[PDB]
Amino acid sequence: ISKEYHIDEEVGFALPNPQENLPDFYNDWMFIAKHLPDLIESGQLRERVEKLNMLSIDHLTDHKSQRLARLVLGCITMAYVWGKGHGDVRKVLPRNIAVPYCQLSKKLELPPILVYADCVLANWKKKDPNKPLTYENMDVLFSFRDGDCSKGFFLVSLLVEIAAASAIKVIPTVFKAMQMQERDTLLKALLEIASCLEKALQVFHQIHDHVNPKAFFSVLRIYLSGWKGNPQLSDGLVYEGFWEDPKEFAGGSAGQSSVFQCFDVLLGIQQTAGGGHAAQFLQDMRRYMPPAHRNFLCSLESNPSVREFVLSKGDAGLREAYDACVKALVSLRSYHLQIVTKYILIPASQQPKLEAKGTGGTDLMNFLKTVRSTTEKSLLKEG
Ligand code: HEM
Ligand SMILES: Clc1ccc(Nc2cnn[nH]2)cc1
């Protein structure tokens, strides 16, 4: 059920109604996190962080407070490490922030780095709680710099999330219909999945309206970047007072989204199969997801193959509904590569000048094409 895997019927993998304020005990954390643009611009971010006293995480009594605290600390860590994003980095996270951050991270079974689940699934609010979940009625809780387009980037990522995730509620219907041998129910279920994934692609079109390519590339990308295979932090980051040696953690990407990974799993697309950089990255990103969501993903893997059921029926209707789900993923990924051209490739070529690295740390072109091609090759027909 939704209670076991923390999948909300309305927002899916997103944290429903995220907490906006921490108890008064954590005001020193909140001020820095709410003023990252101001503190980074004035060159007072590092000093504010270095001046913090060590605060116990014991006053964060519920999941919503813990998730807000993780987001606050994750954003602060990104600002402290990357600074102004011009090249002056910090390889030691001060103990008074690194110790409560790692403690909170350990409790939430998440790495001590800003992840998708923080920055997208918990970084939002409704302006008016009586109006629906649309861009116009929503805002993010935290930004890195003035004009970084984080509102547009995080909210569009979230809106695509909620759109695609309105199909996860159908997954139990799919497995029960295969089990009970209900052909019509399975057909209707796959069509509803295809519909939600088609709707998610149209939701993705809003990106051009709220994200500026220059702002995204030369400002926002910096703060979502991590310390695993990054030449700027080759040995990783020192979490002072928590671990002696520097630790490596990948930056944030929608490769940490449970919604796209769960549909690849359900449809037997096998993005995680064998070796190769793509499979390794997508499997590694499951431990950058909330534990209940990591649990949901491998639970789908233990279920019988939807792809094998459809293939064993000699039913054009079923094969077509399955192919409608796979096509919708291919269309989403093909569109995603058009966006990568506009938001990464074209601005990267305008820089005053081996392979282009994503914030997640992949050779993004080869990775995204590998993943797209694996989806397309799962089509039963399109010869
Ligand atoms: C300015 C817009 C965007 C750009 C430049 C972009 C870029 C990237 C890049 C570079 C990767 C490769 C992983 C990495 O190394 O970071 C990636 C992966 C991914 N992105 Fe985005 N992305 C954008 C918007 C979105 C949006 C709105 C979604 C939908 C929530 C999305 C979904 C994905 C998914 C699902 C992956 C994992 C690979 C896959 O399953 O296809 N991206 N993105
Ligand atoms: Cl921390 C974080 C991680 C990923 C995103 N979105 C994204 C979408 N495609 N790649 N990355 C936003 C914030």
Coordinates of C-alpha atoms and ligand atoms in Angstrom, one line a residue:
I1 CA 0.0 0.0 0.0
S2 CA 0.8 3.8 0.0
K3 CA 1.5 3.7 3.8
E4 CA 4.1 0.9 3.5
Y5 CA 6.1 2.5 0.6
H6 CA 5.3 6.2 1.4
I7 CA 3.8 6.8 -2.0
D8 CA 1.1 9.5 -1.8
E9 CA -2.0 8.9 -4.0
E10 CA -1.8 12.6 -5.2
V11 CA 2.0 13.4 -5.3
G12 CA 3.6 9.9 -5.5
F13 CA 7.2 9.8 -4.4
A14 CA 7.1 13.5 -3.5
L15 CA 6.8 14.4 0.2
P16 CA 3.1 15.6 0.5
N17 CA 2.8 19.2 2.1
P18 CA 6.5 19.6 3.2
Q19 CA 7.3 21.4 6.4
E20 CA 8.3 25.1 5.9
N21 CA 9.7 25.9 9.4
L22 CA 12.0 24.1 11.9
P23 CA 11.6 24.5 15.7
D24 CA 13.1 27.8 17.1
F25 CA 16.2 25.7 18.3
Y26 CA 17.3 25.5 14.6
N27 CA 16.9 29.3 13.7
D28 CA 20.7 29.6 13.1
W29 CA 20.4 26.8 10.4
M30 CA 17.2 28.3 8.8
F31 CA 18.7 31.9 8.6
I32 CA 21.7 30.7 6.5
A33 CA 19.5 28.4 4.3
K34 CA 16.9 31.1 3.7
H35 CA 19.7 33.6 2.9
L36 CA 22.1 31.6 0.7
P37 CA 21.8 34.1 -2.2
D38 CA 22.6 37.1 0.1
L39 CA 25.3 35.3 2.1
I40 CA 27.0 34.0 -1.1
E41 CA 26.9 37.4 -2.8
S42 CA 28.4 39.2 0.3
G43 CA 31.1 36.5 0.9
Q44 CA 29.8 35.8 4.4
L45 CA 28.3 32.3 3.8
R46 CA 31.5 30.4 5.0
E47 CA 31.9 32.6 8.1
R48 CA 28.3 32.1 9.1
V49 CA 28.7 28.3 8.8
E50 CA 32.1 28.4 10.6
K51 CA 30.5 30.4 13.4
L52 CA 27.6 27.9 14.0
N53 CA 27.5 25.9 17.3
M54 CA 26.9 22.2 17.1
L55 CA 23.1 21.7 17.3
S56 CA 21.5 18.3 18.5
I57 CA 19.1 16.7 15.9
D58 CA 17.0 15.4 18.9
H59 CA 14.5 18.2 18.6
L60 CA 13.4 17.0 15.1
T61 CA 10.7 14.6 16.3
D62 CA 8.9 13.7 13.0
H63 CA 9.8 12.8 9.4
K64 CA 8.7 16.2 7.9
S65 CA 11.0 18.1 10.3
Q66 CA 13.9 15.6 9.6
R67 CA 13.4 16.1 5.8
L68 CA 13.3 19.9 6.1
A69 CA 16.4 19.8 8.3
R70 CA 18.1 17.5 5.6
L71 CA 17.2 20.0 2.9
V72 CA 18.4 23.1 4.9
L73 CA 21.7 21.3 5.7
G74 CA 22.1 19.9 2.2
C75 CA 21.7 23.4 0.7
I76 CA 24.1 24.9 3.2
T77 CA 26.7 22.2 2.5
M78 CA 26.4 22.9 -1.3
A79 CA 26.8 26.6 -0.7
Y80 CA 29.7 26.1 1.7
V81 CA 31.6 23.6 -0.6
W82 CA 31.0 25.5 -3.9
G83 CA 30.9 29.1 -2.7
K84 CA 30.5 31.5 -5.6
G85 CA 30.9 28.7 -8.1
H86 CA 34.0 30.3 -9.8
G87 CA 36.5 27.8 -8.4
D88 CA 37.2 28.6 -4.7
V89 CA 36.1 25.3 -3.1
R90 CA 36.2 23.9 0.5
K91 CA 37.3 20.3 1.2
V92 CA 36.4 20.2 4.9
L93 CA 32.8 20.6 6.0
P94 CA 33.0 22.2 9.6
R95 CA 32.2 19.7 12.4
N96 CA 29.3 21.9 13.9
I97 CA 27.4 21.3 10.6
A98 CA 29.0 18.0 9.4
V99 CA 28.2 16.0 12.6
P100 CA 24.4 16.9 12.9
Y101 CA 24.1 16.5 9.0
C102 CA 25.7 13.0 9.0
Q103 CA 23.7 12.0 12.1
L104 CA 20.4 13.1 10.4
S105 CA 21.5 11.4 7.1
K106 CA 22.3 8.1 9.0
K107 CA 18.8 8.2 10.7
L108 CA 17.1 8.8 7.2
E109 CA 19.4 6.3 5.5
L110 CA 20.5 8.9 2.9
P111 CA 24.0 10.0 2.0
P112 CA 25.2 13.4 3.5
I113 CA 24.8 15.2 0.1
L114 CA 21.9 17.1 -1.4
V115 CA 19.7 14.6 -3.3
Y116 CA 16.7 14.7 -5.6
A117 CA 14.4 13.7 -2.7
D118 CA 15.4 16.8 -0.7
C119 CA 15.8 19.4 -3.5
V120 CA 12.7 18.4 -5.5
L121 CA 10.4 16.1 -3.5
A122 CA 10.7 18.2 -0.2
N123 CA 11.6 21.7 -1.6
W124 CA 8.2 23.0 -2.3
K125 CA 5.0 24.7 -1.1
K126 CA 1.5 25.6 -2.3
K127 CA 0.9 29.5 -2.3
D128 CA -2.8 28.9 -1.7
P129 CA -3.7 25.4 -0.2
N130 CA -7.2 25.6 -1.7
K131 CA -5.9 26.0 -5.3
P132 CA -4.4 22.9 -7.1
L133 CA -0.8 21.8 -7.7
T134 CA 0.2 24.0 -10.7
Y135 CA 3.4 26.0 -11.2
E136 CA 1.4 29.3 -10.6
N137 CA 0.2 28.1 -7.2
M138 CA 3.6 26.8 -6.1
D139 CA 7.0 27.9 -4.9
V140 CA 10.4 26.3 -3.7
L141 CA 11.6 26.7 -0.1
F142 CA 15.3 27.3 -0.9
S143 CA 17.4 28.7 -3.7
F144 CA 21.2 29.1 -4.1
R145 CA 21.6 32.4 -6.0
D146 CA 19.4 35.2 -7.2
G147 CA 18.5 34.4 -10.9
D148 CA 19.7 30.7 -10.7
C149 CA 16.2 29.5 -12.0
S150 CA 16.0 27.0 -9.1
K151 CA 12.2 27.7 -8.8
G152 CA 11.6 26.8 -12.5
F153 CA 14.1 23.8 -12.5
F154 CA 13.0 22.2 -9.2
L155 CA 9.2 22.9 -9.7
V156 CA 9.2 21.6 -13.3
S157 CA 11.1 18.5 -12.2
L158 CA 8.5 18.1 -9.4
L159 CA 5.5 18.7 -11.7
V160 CA 6.8 16.0 -14.2
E161 CA 7.3 13.8 -11.0
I162 CA 3.6 14.2 -9.8
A163 CA 2.3 13.7 -13.4
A164 CA 4.2 10.4 -14.1
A165 CA 3.6 9.3 -10.5
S166 CA -0.2 9.3 -10.9
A167 CA 0.4 6.0 -12.7
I168 CA 2.1 4.3 -9.7
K169 CA -1.3 3.8 -8.0
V170 CA -2.1 1.5 -11.1
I171 CA 0.9 -0.8 -10.4
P172 CA -1.0 -3.0 -7.8
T173 CA -3.9 -3.3 -10.4
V174 CA -1.4 -4.5 -13.0
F175 CA 0.1 -7.3 -10.8
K176 CA -3.4 -8.4 -9.5
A177 CA -4.8 -8.5 -13.1
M178 CA -1.9 -10.7 -14.2
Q179 CA -2.4 -13.0 -11.1
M180 CA -6.2 -13.2 -11.4
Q181 CA -5.7 -13.6 -15.2
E182 CA -8.0 -10.5 -15.9
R183 CA -7.1 -9.5 -19.5
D184 CA -9.4 -6.4 -19.7
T185 CA -8.2 -5.0 -16.4
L186 CA -4.5 -5.4 -17.4
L187 CA -5.2 -3.7 -20.7
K188 CA -7.0 -0.7 -19.0
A189 CA -4.2 -0.5 -16.4
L190 CA -1.3 -0.3 -19.1
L191 CA -3.3 2.3 -21.1
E192 CA -3.8 4.5 -17.9
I193 CA 0.0 4.2 -17.3
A194 CA 0.8 5.2 -21.0
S195 CA -1.7 8.2 -20.5
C196 CA 0.1 9.5 -17.4
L197 CA 3.5 9.2 -19.0
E198 CA 2.2 11.0 -22.1
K199 CA 0.8 13.8 -19.7
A200 CA 4.2 14.0 -18.0
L201 CA 5.9 14.9 -21.3
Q202 CA 3.5 17.8 -21.9
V203 CA 4.2 18.9 -18.3
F204 CA 7.9 18.9 -19.2
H205 CA 7.2 21.7 -21.9
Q206 CA 6.9 24.4 -19.1
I207 CA 10.8 24.1 -18.7
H208 CA 11.4 26.7 -21.5
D209 CA 9.1 29.2 -19.8
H210 CA 10.8 29.1 -16.3
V211 CA 14.4 28.0 -16.9
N212 CA 17.0 30.2 -18.7
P213 CA 19.9 28.2 -20.4
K214 CA 22.7 30.6 -19.3
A215 CA 21.4 30.9 -15.7
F216 CA 20.9 27.1 -15.4
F217 CA 24.4 26.2 -16.9
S218 CA 26.7 28.8 -15.4
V219 CA 24.9 29.2 -12.0
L220 CA 22.5 26.4 -10.8
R221 CA 24.5 23.3 -12.1
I222 CA 27.4 24.2 -9.7
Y223 CA 25.3 23.7 -6.6
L224 CA 23.8 20.4 -7.6
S225 CA 27.3 19.0 -8.4
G226 CA 28.9 16.4 -6.0
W227 CA 32.2 15.0 -4.9
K228 CA 32.5 11.5 -6.6
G229 CA 34.7 11.4 -9.6
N230 CA 34.9 15.3 -9.5
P231 CA 38.5 16.6 -10.1
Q232 CA 37.7 19.6 -7.8
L233 CA 37.2 17.2 -4.9
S234 CA 39.2 14.1 -6.1
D235 CA 39.3 12.4 -2.7
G236 CA 35.8 13.5 -1.7
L237 CA 34.7 15.7 1.2
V238 CA 35.9 15.6 4.9
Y239 CA 32.9 15.4 7.2
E240 CA 34.8 16.8 10.2
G241 CA 34.1 15.1 13.5
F242 CA 32.1 12.3 11.8
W243 CA 34.6 10.5 9.6
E244 CA 38.4 10.9 9.6
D245 CA 38.9 10.2 5.8
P246 CA 37.3 12.3 3.0
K247 CA 34.1 10.6 1.5
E248 CA 32.9 10.6 -2.1
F249 CA 29.2 11.1 -2.9
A250 CA 27.5 11.7 -6.3
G251 CA 25.8 15.0 -7.0
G252 CA 22.0 15.3 -7.6
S253 CA 20.2 14.0 -10.7
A254 CA 16.7 12.7 -11.7
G255 CA 18.6 9.3 -12.0
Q256 CA 17.7 9.4 -8.2
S257 CA 14.0 9.6 -9.2
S258 CA 12.0 6.6 -8.3
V259 CA 9.3 7.2 -10.8
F260 CA 11.4 6.6 -14.1
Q261 CA 13.3 3.7 -12.5
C262 CA 10.1 2.0 -11.3
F263 CA 8.5 2.1 -14.9
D264 CA 11.7 0.7 -16.4
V265 CA 11.5 -2.1 -13.8
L266 CA 7.7 -2.8 -14.3
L267 CA 8.0 -2.9 -18.1
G268 CA 11.2 -5.1 -18.0
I269 CA 13.3 -2.4 -19.7
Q270 CA 16.4 -3.6 -17.6
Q271 CA 18.3 -0.3 -17.3
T272 CA 20.1 -1.9 -14.3
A273 CA 21.1 -5.2 -16.2
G274 CA 24.7 -6.4 -16.2
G275 CA 27.7 -4.1 -16.2
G276 CA 28.3 -0.9 -18.0
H277 CA 28.3 2.7 -16.6
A278 CA 24.6 3.3 -17.1
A279 CA 23.5 0.2 -15.2
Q280 CA 26.0 0.8 -12.4
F281 CA 24.9 4.5 -12.0
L282 CA 21.2 3.7 -11.9
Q283 CA 21.7 0.9 -9.4
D284 CA 24.0 3.2 -7.2
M285 CA 21.4 6.0 -7.3
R286 CA 18.8 3.7 -5.5
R287 CA 20.7 4.3 -2.2
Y288 CA 20.4 8.1 -2.9
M289 CA 16.6 7.5 -2.7
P290 CA 14.4 7.4 0.5
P291 CA 14.5 3.8 2.0
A292 CA 10.8 3.2 1.4
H293 CA 11.3 4.2 -2.2
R294 CA 14.4 2.0 -2.6
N295 CA 12.2 -0.8 -1.0
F296 CA 9.4 -0.2 -3.6
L297 CA 11.8 -0.5 -6.5
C298 CA 13.4 -3.8 -5.6
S299 CA 9.9 -5.1 -4.6
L300 CA 8.8 -4.6 -8.2
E301 CA 11.9 -6.6 -9.3
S302 CA 10.7 -9.6 -7.2
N303 CA 7.3 -9.6 -9.1
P304 CA 6.5 -11.6 -12.3
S305 CA 7.4 -10.0 -15.6
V306 CA 4.7 -7.8 -17.2
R307 CA 6.7 -7.9 -20.5
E308 CA 6.8 -11.8 -20.4
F309 CA 3.0 -12.0 -19.6
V310 CA 2.1 -9.7 -22.6
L311 CA 4.5 -11.7 -24.9
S312 CA 2.8 -15.0 -24.0
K313 CA -0.8 -14.0 -24.8
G314 CA -0.9 -13.5 -28.7
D315 CA -3.0 -10.5 -27.9
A316 CA -2.4 -7.4 -30.1
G317 CA -4.4 -5.2 -27.7
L318 CA -2.1 -6.1 -24.8
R319 CA 1.1 -5.7 -26.9
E320 CA -0.1 -2.3 -28.1
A321 CA -0.9 -1.0 -24.6
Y322 CA 2.5 -2.3 -23.4
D323 CA 4.2 -0.6 -26.4
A324 CA 2.2 2.7 -25.6
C325 CA 4.0 2.7 -22.1
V326 CA 7.4 2.0 -23.7
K327 CA 6.8 4.7 -26.4
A328 CA 5.8 7.3 -23.9
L329 CA 9.2 6.7 -22.0
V330 CA 11.2 6.9 -25.3
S331 CA 9.3 10.2 -26.2
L332 CA 10.1 11.6 -22.7
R333 CA 13.8 10.6 -23.0
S334 CA 14.1 11.9 -26.6
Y335 CA 12.6 15.2 -25.5
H336 CA 15.0 15.2 -22.4
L337 CA 18.0 15.0 -24.9
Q338 CA 16.6 18.0 -26.8
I339 CA 16.5 19.9 -23.5
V340 CA 20.1 18.8 -22.6
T341 CA 21.2 20.3 -26.0
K342 CA 19.5 23.7 -25.1
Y343 CA 20.4 23.8 -21.4
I344 CA 23.9 22.1 -21.3
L345 CA 25.5 21.6 -24.9
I346 CA 24.7 25.0 -26.5
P347 CA 25.8 27.1 -23.3
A348 CA 28.9 24.8 -22.8
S349 CA 29.9 25.6 -26.4
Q350 CA 29.6 29.4 -25.6
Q351 CA 32.1 29.1 -22.7
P352 CA 35.6 30.8 -23.4
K353 CA 37.5 27.7 -24.7
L354 CA 37.1 15.3 -21.9
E355 CA 33.4 14.4 -22.1
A356 CA 30.5 16.5 -20.7
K357 CA 29.7 15.5 -17.1
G358 CA 26.2 15.7 -15.6
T359 CA 25.6 16.9 -12.0
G360 CA 25.1 13.2 -11.2
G361 CA 28.6 12.5 -12.5
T362 CA 27.9 10.5 -15.7
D363 CA 29.3 11.1 -19.2
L364 CA 25.8 12.5 -19.7
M365 CA 25.6 12.1 -23.6
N366 CA 26.6 8.4 -23.7
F367 CA 24.6 7.7 -20.5
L368 CA 21.3 9.4 -21.7
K369 CA 21.6 7.8 -25.2
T370 CA 22.4 4.3 -23.6
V371 CA 19.3 4.7 -21.4
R372 CA 17.1 6.0 -24.3
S373 CA 18.3 3.2 -26.7
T374 CA 17.6 0.5 -24.0
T375 CA 14.0 1.8 -23.7
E376 CA 13.5 1.9 -27.6
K377 CA 14.9 -1.7 -27.9
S378 CA 12.2 -2.9 -25.5
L379 CA 9.5 -2.1 -28.0
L380 CA 7.6 -5.2 -29.1
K381 CA 7.0 -3.5 -32.5
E382 CA 8.2 -0.3 -34.4
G383 CA 10.2 -2.0 -37.2
Ligands
HEM1 C1 17.2 22.0 -17.7 C2 16.6 20.7 -17.7 C3 17.3 19.5 -17.6 C4 18.6 19.1 -17.9 C5 19.7 19.9 -18.5 C6 18.7 17.7 -17.5 C7 19.9 17.0 -17.6 C8 20.1 15.7 -17.2 C9 21.4 15.0 -17.2 C10 22.7 15.6 -17.5 C11 21.2 13.7 -16.8 C12 22.2 12.6 -16.7 C13 22.6 12.3 -15.2 C14 23.6 13.2 -14.6 O1 24.9 12.9 -14.7 O2 23.3 14.2 -13.9 C15 19.8 13.6 -16.5 C16 19.2 12.4 -16.1 C17 17.8 12.4 -15.9 N1 16.9 13.4 -16.1 FE1 17.3 15.3 -16.4 N2 17.6 17.2 -17.1 C18 16.7 18.2 -17.1 C19 15.4 18.1 -16.7 C20 14.8 17.0 -16.3 C21 13.5 16.9 -15.9 C22 12.5 18.0 -15.8 C23 13.2 15.6 -15.7 C24 11.9 15.1 -15.2 C25 11.7 14.9 -13.9 C26 14.4 14.9 -15.9 C27 14.6 13.6 -15.8 C28 15.7 12.9 -15.9 C29 15.8 11.5 -15.6 C30 14.7 10.5 -15.3 C31 17.2 11.2 -15.6 C32 17.8 9.8 -15.4 C33 18.1 9.1 -16.7 C34 16.9 8.5 -17.3 O3 16.1 7.6 -16.5 O4 16.5 8.8 -18.4 N3 15.4 15.7 -16.3 N4 19.1 14.8 -16.7
LIG2 CL1 19.5 18.1 -6.0 C1 18.6 17.8 -7.5 C2 18.8 16.7 -8.2 C3 18.1 16.6 -9.5 C4 17.3 17.6 -9.9 N1 16.7 17.4 -11.2 C5 17.2 16.8 -12.3 C6 16.5 16.5 -13.5 N2 17.4 15.9 -14.3 N3 18.6 15.8 -13.7 N4 18.5 16.4 -12.5 C7 17.1 18.7 -9.1 C8 17.7 18.8 -7.9

